[PDB]
C-alpha cells in the first residue's frame, strides 16, 4: 500500500556507526519501529564525529502517487560553533520516484572546539496537502566540531577553515595567502 | 660615493598617482628632497585606494659595499579593518646588488569599510652596524578598505574575502561553499 522509503545506505552507515548495513528510517510510508519511542532512540544517537562533515540519506516515492517534502527548519542552536545545517536540494520539492541521495551538511566554523545542537525539521505531504510524515516534534541532533589549525598557518589576516585550507582575503592567494 | 637606491617604478607610480614616472625615494644613499619636511610630504600622501591590495618598491645596493635592511615594525593600528602589512622578503637581510622588487601587502579583512592607519618601520645599516637610513620617526600611512560582497554570497558559514572569493570551511568547496 505505502510507497515512501527513507534510509541510510550501507556505505554511509559503516562510516557513521561501524556496521555496513542499510539503516531503515521509513519503509512503505511507515516510520521504523526504533523511532516510535524517540527519546529512547535519541539517547542511542552519539554526537556526529569531527571527521564527518556531511551525511547522505536516500529516499524514494516508489509508486505512482506523488509526494512533496519541505524543510521547515535547518537551524544551529550554537551559531558560534557550527553554522546552520544545509541540504543539497531545494527546500520544497517532489520526493523523487527514482531513489536519490540528499546530502545534509554540518558546517563547523573552525573557530571553537565543542558540540553544536541543531535541528532538521522536515515534513512529507501527500497530493491532498496533508502531512503524513515528519521529523519527531522537538528533535535535537548533535555535531562534534574542532578548532581549525592549518599547516604553516594563514598569513595576511587569513583564517584556517575546517577542511585545513586557508581562507585568504583580498588579492591574496595560495596555500598560506602569500601570492598576489 | 653613495650607492643605495629606493624608488617606485614608473608602472606602479601610474596605478597609484596617475603619472608614469619613477618616484625617487633614496638616491646614492641620500633621502629625496621631498622627504626632508616629512609632515608636509605626508599631507600630500592620500589613503591607498580600495583597488590597490599591494605596492611594489624597487631597491638596490649598486656598488661593492654591503648593506643590511631590517623591518622593525609592520603594524596595523586598526586591526578590525586591515591586518598587519606584510613584505615578500625576510625581515632581516642584505640589500641586493641587482635591482629587485619588494612587494608590501595591505590585507583588508573585508569585514568593515573604512581607513586603516599602519606602520612600515624599516632601517638600513652599513657593514659597521650603524643605521644610515630609516623610515622617518612616527610615520603613519593609510589604506582604504571595503566590506566584502561576493556574487551569490557564501553558504555553509563561509565568508567573502576582499578578492571576491568565498572563504569555505571544513569539507566545503567551490564558488559558494556548496560542494563536498
Ligand atoms: C533527507 C531527510 C533527513 C531526515 C533526517 C533528520 C536528521 C538529519 C540530521 C542528522 C541525524 C543523524 C545524527 C546521528 C548519527 C548517528 O549516530 O546515527 C546512527 C543511528 C543508530 O541507528 P542503529 O544503531 O542502526 O539502530 C537503528 C536501526 N536498527 C538497527 C535498530 C534497526 O541511526 C539514526 O539514529 C538515524 C538518525 C536519523 C533519524 C531521524 C528521523 C527523521 C524522520 C523524518 C521523517 C520525514 C521525512 C520522510 C521522507 C520519506
Ligand atoms: C621596501 C621599503 C619600503 C619603504 C616605504 C615605507 C612606506 C610603505 C607603505 C606605503 C607608502 C605609500 C602610501 C602612499 C601612496 C602614495 O600616494 O604615494 C604617492 C606619493 C606622491 O609622490 P609624488 O607626488 O611623486 O611627489 C614626490 C616626488 N616628486 C615628484 C615630488 C619628485 O609618493 C610617496 O609619498 C611615496 C611614499 C613612501 C615614502 C616613505 C619613506 C620611506 C623611506 C625608507 C628609508 C629606509 C629604506 C632605504 C632603502 C634603500
Ligand atoms: C555521499 O553521496 C555522494 C553522492 O554521490 C558520494 O559522492 C559520497 O561519496 C557519499 N559519501 C558517503 C560517506 O557515502
Ligand atoms: C609588482 O611586481 C610584481 C613582480 O613581478 C609584478 O608581477 C606585478 O605586476 C607588479 N605590480 C604593479 C602594479 O606593477
Ligand atoms: Na592565520
Ligand atoms: Na556568507
Curated annotation (Swiss-Prot), chains A, B:
Domain EGF-like, first and last residues per copy: 146-178
Disulfide bonds: 108-145, 150-160, 154-166, 168-177
WIF domain: residues covered: 6-145
Top-level lineage group: Eukaryota
Subcellular location: Secreted
Glycosylation sites: 56
Function field: Binds to WNT proteins and inhibits their activities. May be involved in mesoderm segmentation.
Record note on quaternary structure: Interacts with MYOC.
Name the record gives this protein: Wnt inhibitory factor 1
Species whose genome carries this gene: Homo sapiens
Amino acid at each position: 500500500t505505502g510507497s515512501l522509503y527513507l534510509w541510510i545506505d550501507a556505505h554511509q552507515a559503516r562510516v557513521l556507526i561501524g556496521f555496513e548495513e542499510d539503516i531503515l528510517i521509513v519503509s512503505e510510508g511507515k516510520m521504523a519501529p526504533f523511532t516510535h519511542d524517540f527519546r529512547k532512540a535519541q539517547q542511542r544517537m552519539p554526537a556526529i564525529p569531527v571527521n564527518i562533515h556531511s551525511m547522505n540519506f536516500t529516499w524514494q516515492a516508489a509508486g505512482q502517487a506523488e509526494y512533496f517534502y519541505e524543510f521547515l527548519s535547518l537551524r544551529s542552536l550554537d551559531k558560534g560553533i557550527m553554522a546552520d545545517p544545509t541540504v543539497n536540494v531545494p527546500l520544497l520539492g517532489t520526493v523523487p520516484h527514482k531513489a536519490s541521495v540528499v546530502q545534509v551538511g554540518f558546517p563547523c566554523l573552525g573557530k571553537q572546539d565543542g558540540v553544536a545542537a541543531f535541528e532538521v525539521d522536515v515534513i512529507v505531504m501527500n497530493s491532498e496537502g496533508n502531512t503524513i510524515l515528519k521529523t519527531p516534534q522537538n528533535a535535537i541532533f548533535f555535531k562534534t566540531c574542532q578548532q581549525a589549525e592549518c599547516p604553516g598557518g594563514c598569513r595576511n589576516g587569513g583564517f584556517c577553515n575546517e577542511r585545513r585550507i586557508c581562507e585568504c582575503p583580498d588579492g591574496f592567494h595560495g596555500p598560506h595567502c602569500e601570492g598576489t
